[PDB]
Design a protein around this ligand. Structure first.
Ligand code: HEM
Ligand code: HEM
Ligand SMILES: [Cl-]
Ligand code: NA
Ligand code: NA
Lengths: 712, 712
């Protein structure tokens, strides 16, 4: 059947805003995962997982009689899709069990790992999510083989359909770089927001860059992709050598033996894939990557044998039974045990990418330190394994269960505890009146609260107004945040705060983080009053102020809005049309198409635009909350044309007289162009819509102010 | 960006079950269109629409100074997408304003017509839908130009995104037959469920079949496509001759002047398309179809001039100014007015498809009768226009406002009024005990109530258990309904009815329609009891029994289920795989994926399979309501393979011993295979899910029993 996407392959896709509907969710609308998890007997789950580690199924026999290695790779792959650029991927939604990730070549035979866990998932039911189980299983694998983990948090709710993610433009799995859809340009520059070298890989090609078995060149791809997944040199070395302390690769015969990935397989495979015609198809005959490497003398026990082997031998380029590049120890004894035959032993082997840890000069210093000091190695690995598997879980308030680490980590963007009484309804009314009496405008108050709250992204639950980090480096200097206007608003608000907190009894006080949001609420109420409408904007106190010392300035760079349609802002020119970037921004904010529409039309007439640009400001009563944006956009008395200067900017002229009435961007005019957005704009631009516009605008304003409020 | 559809273009699409969520809907979840429409001043709207008819806009000037013809085409095209095969298309959801229909070639310049209506839509807001306004505007155009309509119902709620319709497989607009995705095979057989001859046409090609100007062969396409839109010979002639009493076609210059359709046009076109470089690009210079035909000497007034011209001249094949085939009257004077220049007159002209009404022998007799009896033409056209424009609105109980015709029409599948007290909860408990004491089994009761209720489709709101049509021709004879078993159940239930109605005083009686659904509910109660669960199934009385004379046997044939995965039924072998037909059926029943999953798992263990097939009956306690289907399907102890005889039947064998445990169809095993369906099966197959399975099943059972209950 030919679809709208076939006919008009470049039209905006709004479906990404309407995923995760009550319709697709088999749980009741009242289902609370946290409430179910908090009654889970986690100790009983961990005992079942521990017994599973050494209970081989004949449909996928356990290497060395232990599934630990397989389950560590499973949990590492669940977490390893994460990109810092947009916070998409990671383990936080259990997306490994859906398309496309369930059928990525780098996830080959993790279908077997997930099937081994069905009996335990079945036993504990809704009290443990697949998303949590995949990570827990990884932890129990490590614990069962003598490794002390840093801890574990539950709270990853299951999802019921594929995340809409840009994974790249290539039309062939594992396509080498330099093709018609190359993710590389210039001097091997990987396109944002990608964090893997090839379509269907987690980070890098274990053979080396585009198959070239050079460990030095491979090191470059390792550093670049791992930085793009929030990992520095020390963390990267600890993770790779930590993982490759356990288990083995599978390359027993030619890859051409392996059949269809799960999403392409027959219905009778019942959700499994990569069926191999090679000998038994499994166990001693398994083919996964096409490499055949076993790193250590005890693949089912924690050791420091990975670095002993890395540094204790010289390495020779060789080929797996499948014809993949890999390395073997020159002049070595057969010291490595076979996975199935207790009478066979093998020489030490390494991947190109393992030799990166010795032949990259910066990696070599860390690898030597970890070699000489295996206790430093074990602590770095434990901290990195925690960070990897929790990086997208959001604030510490979301962390459930008895194994949550007490140590607060810089990477968590921590919020101090609140140790004092909160402001009540009468206090909030008093502070709103003081804000409005200071002379701060609707535009200053709405702009500032928008700038603070709109850094939130539901992809990894980073950002939001909690913390008041808008006052700190680097947020206070982001071009979109208008740093000089921002500094003047914050100076006034901080004087209001000091005066209010000075006058209080009983330790009651208000955070700047709360006052920034409450001020924006006053601005919206004033705008409604300006329009002749009395509304109360909801407000929930309880935000706290984080310090500069509790803020990683480098990690915060990825939250800079370089495109924000709701402020008619574009830092530079991009491949991607501005209207596509607007819908991407709405998805990160968790907004529906109706919520995006009403929010943007309101923000335009409140003066939220960066630099007080007139673009899209379709009103003669700026700083009044009206549906003017919609009534004026949909007026067929106005005709629109691109400017000679700039084809991304449109003039709206009286169709009769040619008089210039308005200017607008692609972000403004898409609401009068796109057939589904124009239908929404019509509802808000109708003569009966004033009360609905104000109500809906206040609702979506309050939603944005509260995105990071997991403390509630 | 490469998507799951790009990687796996044959996988099932579940997104069609999760459209029309609260997320995409700008209205509150409490919004009731019927209540809004009931408060509309319909008189005021019609005055505004009368005024609009002759208020010409410069950007699309009115032919003859009256938009009536354009608006009649607009309304005809809104209604004209309808197919009897699945009930999809039609005017009932206002889909002409969305992709792809807003951009079909046959809908060229109807973007101008919809834009002319924006001021009226704006003025009345949510109190009149686009869907109601398109039809009402058609009605007012006819009334303006002197034709009395049969009436008008409101109540078509607006929709907020495109409907998922199979319009065909061609990848080229207007592709002629015999291409690589031909909708024709054999002796010009049109594939079900399509009801148009080319991709992007409403019914037929106005030049003739694949552009060959033979009015006799064109008549064959007209008869076939109109039949597939529920219209017989009389209705077809009345509609074509009626429509083409008004207005004109547009082909003033070559089609190459005409630019991008609306979904392809620049953002500056603000939702309009087909911008033309020919002269002024509008009015006298307009290009829409490429044909240049004006039928009557009074194109803005009801006349008898269509059939006077048709029969009154001999016709000569000629070419429009765009190169299109059309016909001119031999030796005629210039009697037809110009649309713009009072000093120009034209000879009569006709389309190939107009001449069909004269040169097809069966049409010729109707056309001659209409020519000789113009009152019979006016009455037939008025009745056909009402049917065309209301065909997909469902039972008369949905019809709103003060212009609803009182006459009950056979095509409405009418239900008699209830004129008696209904059964109460005490009566319902008595009837259920009598049903269970009769000896009717769980399997008999569930199968019968499923057969009765599951004919409903939300596409045109035809079907359902109201009317007890399962006891009439043709439903009582349908293979899927198991005619011999059905006869036996109906006889027993009619004996219980006769005895209950005979014992009543005060006129109280129960309909067979009610008793069939109540007897199904008792069957589900009994099944729950068989499984040790205490369950009440909700029931709402008030169905009535329709007569055979109130049931058009030929119209009822299109509701026959030739595929029903819920009974593991396939009537023959189709090109579409059975799991695609299952999701298609779920969409028609208005089911979500979770609802489809629970229902099918339950029906399999209750014995609802046609012919008592063992396929998918994965329980050892048939007629007990359990989640056995899920627990057994997901059991990894079982391995599945297609049979020798039949690649569409699968055997489930113990992995260890090779013993046969189960058999299943594609419809059974897709729940074990598709990654999203398997995630749902797992919820219902978990150790904590027995009660949730029972309660979810009862909810979706009652939902199906109530689908056609608009009387509530
Ligand atoms: C440059 C980064 C990495 C590369 C290129 C890489 C590559 C690979 C490859 C090709 C395999 C073999 C797959 C098979 O044939 O079964 C594998 C196995 C494995 N990897 Fe990695 N890996 C990397 C990082 C990591 C990290 C960060 C972890 C965990 C902290 C990890 C843990 C494992 C484990 C446990 C296995 C063994 C699976 C088993 O026993 O079945 N890897 N790796
Ligand atoms: C065999 C079936 C039919 C064919 C092939 C057909 C074909 C056409 C074509 C090609 C046009 C010219 C479009 C243009 O260039 O602007 C037209 C116009 C029109 N048709 Fe039909 N039509 C059919 C049936 C109907 C029916 C059922 C109705 C209404 C009951 C209808 C009412 C109209 C009217 C009112 C116009 C004039 C538009 C104007 O004045 O702007 N037609 N038709
Ligand atoms: Cl639930
Ligand atoms: Na994420
Ligand atoms: Na329909």
């Amino acid at each position: 059947g030919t679809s709208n996407r076939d006919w008009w392959p470049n039209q905006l896709d709004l479906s990404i805003l309407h995923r995760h509907s009550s319709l697709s969710d088999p749980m009741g609308k009242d289902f609370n995962y946290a409430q179910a998890f908090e009654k889970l007997d986690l100790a009983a789950v961990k005992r079942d997982l521990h017994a599973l580690m050494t209970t081989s199924q004949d449909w996928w026999p356990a290497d060395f009689g232990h599934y630990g290695g397989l389950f560590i790779r499973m949990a590492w792959h669940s977490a390893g899709t994460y990109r810092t650029a947009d916070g998409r991927g990671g383990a936080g939604e259990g997306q490994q069990r859906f398309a496309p990730l369930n059928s990525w070549p780098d996830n080959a035979n993790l279908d077997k790992a997930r099937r081994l866990l069905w009996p335990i998932k079945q036993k504990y039911g809704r009290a443990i999510s697949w998303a949590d189980l995949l990570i827990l299983t990884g932890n129990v694998a490590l614990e069962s083989m003598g490794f002390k983990t840093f801890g574990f948090a539950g709270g990853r709710a299951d999802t019921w359909e594929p995340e809409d993610v840009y994974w790249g433009s290539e039309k062939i799995w594992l396509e080498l770089s330099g093709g018609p859809n190359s993710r590389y340009s210039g001097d091997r520059q990987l396109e944002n927001p990608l964090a893997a070298v090839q379509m269907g890989l987690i980070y890098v090609n274990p053979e080396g860059p585009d198959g070239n078995p050079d460990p030095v060149a491979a090191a470059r791809d390792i550093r670049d992709t791992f930085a793009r997944m929030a990992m520095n040199d020390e963390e990267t070395v600890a993770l790779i050598a930590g993982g490759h302390t356990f288990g083995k690769t599978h390359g027993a015969g030619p890859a051409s033996n392996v059949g269809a990935e799960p999403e392409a397989a027959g219905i009778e495979a019942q959700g499994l894939g990569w069926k191999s015609a090679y000998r038994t198809g499994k166990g001693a005959d398994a083919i996964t990557s096409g490499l055949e490497v076993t790193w250590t003398t005890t693949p089912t026990q924690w050791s420091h044998n990975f670095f002993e082997n890395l540094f204790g031998y010289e390495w020779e380029l060789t080929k797996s039974p499948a014809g993949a590049h890999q390395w073997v120890a020159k002049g070595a004894d057969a010291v490595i045990p076979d996975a199935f035959d207790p009478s066979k032993k093998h020489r030490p082997t390494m991947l190109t990418t393992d030799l990166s840890l010795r032949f990259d000069p910066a990696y070599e210093k860390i690898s030597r330190r970890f070699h000489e000091n295996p206790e430093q190695f074990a602590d770095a690995f434990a901290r990195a394994w925690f960070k990897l598997t929790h990086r997208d879980m959001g604030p510490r308030a979301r962390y459930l269960g008895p194994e949550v680490p007490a140590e607060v980590l810089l990477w968590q963007d921590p919020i101090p505890a609140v140790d004092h009484p909160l402001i009540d309804a009468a206090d909030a009314a008093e502070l709103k009146a003081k804000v409005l009496a200071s002379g701060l405008t609707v535009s200053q108050l709405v702009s500032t609260a928008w700038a603070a709250a709109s850094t939130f992204r539901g992809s990894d639950k980073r950002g939001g107004a909690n913390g008041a980090r808008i006052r700190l480096a680097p947020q206070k200097d982001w071009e979109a945040n208008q740093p000089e206007q921002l500094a003047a608003v914050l100076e006034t608000l901080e004087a209001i705060r000091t005066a209010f907190n000075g006058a209080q009894r009983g330790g009651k006080q208000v955070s700047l983080a709360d006052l920034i949001v409450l001020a924006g609420c006053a601005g919206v109420e004033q705008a409604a009053k300006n329009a002749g409408h009395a509304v109360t904007v909801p407000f929930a106190p309880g935000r706290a102020d984080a310090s500069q010392e509790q803020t990683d300035v480098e990690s915060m760079a990825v939250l800079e809005p370089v495109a924000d349609g709701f402020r008619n802002y574009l830092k530079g020119k991009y491949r991607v049309p501005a209207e596509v970037l607007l819908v991407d921004k709405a998805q990160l904010l968790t907004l529906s198409a109706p919520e995006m529409t009403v929010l943007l039309g309101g923000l335009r007439v409140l003066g939220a635009n960066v630099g007080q640009s007139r673009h899209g400001v379709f009103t003669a009563r700026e700083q009044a909350l009206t549906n003017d944006f919609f009534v004026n956009l949909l007026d067929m008395g106005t005709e629109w044309k691109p400017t000679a200067a700039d084809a991304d900017v449109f003039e709206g002229r009286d169709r009769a007289t040619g008089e210039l009435k308005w200017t607008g961007t692609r972000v403004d005019l898409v609401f009068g162009s796109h057939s589904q957005l124009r239908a929404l704009a019509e509802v808000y631009g109708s003569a009966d819509a004033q009360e609905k516009f104000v109500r809906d605008f206040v609702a979506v304003w309050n939603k944005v102010m509260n995105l990071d409020r997991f403390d509630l």
